Design a protein around this ligand. Structure first.
Ligand code: ZN
Ligand code: ZN
Ligand code: ZN
Ligand code: ZN
Lengths: 162, 162
């Protein structure tokens, strides 16, 4: 439908609008006890969201542009990757938040990968704690740690061996 | 509300029956380039599954016992933890497979924890690769690794900073 050149124009106007989103500066764990700073550019909570942006459900938004009378819509976080393959290993690529902040649309905080890869960064030790993700994590995952397991492997008799 | 004695009887009968489940030896990644050996006790693919066991949907089974003239049913993997709280402050406890093998019912391969703790093990480096789970993993998670990220963080202009 859209040529690569038209797509580039879409990504550029998207970057300009997102660049005006209010910035939140916060400190995050990088792994191994090291602290770092991130600058998230967050989409407003209420209209005005910025030209082309609109809510798309509970906590999702989409970017919409009408080109040559045809209406085009994209998930709000996906625009930076419109020229990239949209699947890998047979899995649909998703806009993954390295900052783990849903409202953030900073392209420096997003990557394009499968939902599984996306989900996993959540338990990742971080760039400074052992992260082995080829496209390195920006911070330690929010869910990383010992867990809260209430009961471990056990047996009353002697029927089993590990 | 079964007495403590009745519950012990349920676990004991469960253990004896699962103990007669065919034992499959799997060699799995431990992390750190090392491999280990696990003995999974797998529930048959079709009837007969074993005394007290029945299919409860796809890839799910139930264990039933008649106590005081009443049939009781539990998820086939939950029996080892019948004496433990079923939730911590509302957070539902789940039978988590440390061996990541659904058909396996080896109690030495199961732990009792929340869905999040359960999910996170999917990406753990393993017991020899840096696992930090309080209740240590028996192996490296199936999804652990560099991942397959199509595109990483990047911006075209200079509207953003990390
Ligand atoms: Zn961010
Ligand atoms: Zn990582
Ligand atoms: Zn097993
Ligand atoms: Zn672990």
């Amino acid at each position: 439908a859209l040529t690569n050149a038209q797509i580039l124009a879409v990504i550029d106007s998207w970057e300009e609008t997102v660049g005006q989103f209010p910035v939140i500066t916060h400190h995050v764990p990088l792994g191994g006890g090291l602290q770092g700073t991130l600058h998230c550019y967050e989409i407003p909570l209420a209209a005005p969201y910025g030209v082309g942006f609109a809510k798309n459900g509970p906590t999702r938004w989409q970017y919409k542009r009408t080109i040559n009378q045809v209406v085009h819509r994209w998930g709000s976080h996906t625009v930076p990757f419109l020229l990239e393959p949209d699947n890998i290993n047979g899995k649909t690529c998703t806009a993954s938040h390295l900052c783990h902040n849903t409202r953030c649309h900073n392209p420096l905080h997003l990557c394009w990968e499968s939902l599984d890869d996306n989900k996993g960064r959540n338990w990742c030790p971080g760039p400074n704690g052992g992260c082995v993700h080829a496209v390195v994590c920006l911070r330690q995952g929010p869910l990383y740690g010992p867990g809260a397991t209430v009961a471990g492997p056990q047996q009353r008799g002697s029927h089993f061996v590990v």
